[PDB]
Amino acid sequence: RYLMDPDTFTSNFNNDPLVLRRRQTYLCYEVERLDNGTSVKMDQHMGFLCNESGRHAELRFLDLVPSLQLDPAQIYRVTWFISWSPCFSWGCAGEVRAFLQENTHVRLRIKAARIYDYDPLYKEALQMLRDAGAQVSIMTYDEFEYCWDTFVYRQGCPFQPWDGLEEHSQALSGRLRAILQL
Ligand SMILES: [Zn+2]
């Protein structure tokens, strides 16, 4: 499988509000099948995506779900490690909602590096995802390092954190939890 350039990862998954990266999203994904509380990790179905020519990464993920040949009689958990929380105003939250309503064999876990509050309706996007059944949280050091180790062409080099990672993660987490309080 194809591993991401390290500079692409660091520039995009950074959670420092002073680092600008509003033009692009990277979305790393994995899939597991849930068999009576037992997890079947399906490494054949892992990868990453970015926005391309006006189509947001999230919709590009939905586009490839058919190619995963999921068995609708089974249950799968999709996990997204996404550099921005999904938008509302350009359709991602609504498409994910509609996808999950039609594909009840899929559960979705979303771990976001930053909140995409450039969208005036970003709170509505987060709440729509929650209420469609998606579990939304903010990426922590643990998840940043996991993504580095899993999706990045790192050549054995360890994850090197940017300054303030933990502080920014906790601040975003407080914001997200207040938005999703329920
Ligand atoms: Zn979007």
Partners of 38 in beta bridges: 35
3-state secondary structure of 121: coil
Q: How far is the CA of 90 from the centre of ligand 1 (A)?
A: 5
Q: How far is the CA of 51 from the centre of ligand 1 (A)?
A: 9
Distance between CA 105 and CA 112 in Å, rounded? 23
Distance between CA 46 and CA 76 in Å, rounded? 13
Resolution of this structure in Å: 1.7
Q: Which of 164, 145, 162 is nearest to 154 (CA)?
A: 145
Q: Which of 36, 102, 37, 105 is nearest to 75 (CA)?
A: 105
The answer to whether 27 and 49 have CB atoms below 8 angstroms apart is yes
Binding residues for Zn(2+): 56, 87, 92
Q: How far is the CA of 157 from the centre of ligand 1 (A)?
A: 32
Beta strands of the chain (E only): which ranges? 26-35, 38-41, 47-50, 76-84, 106-114, 135-138
How many domains does the chain fold into?
1
Question: Which sequence positions are flagged as catalytic?
Answer: 58
Q: How far is the CA of 54 from the centre of ligand 1 (A)?
A: 10
Q: Which of 40, 24, 30 is nearest to 1 (CA)?
A: 30
Q: Which of 143, 171, 159 is nearest to 10 (CA)?
A: 159
Range of the domain at 112: 1-182
Method: X-ray
Distance between CA 52 and CA 43 in Å, rounded? 24
Binding residues: 56, 87, 92
Q: How far is the CA of 88 from the centre of ligand 1 (A)?
A: 6
Residue 37 CA to chain centroid, in angstroms?
23
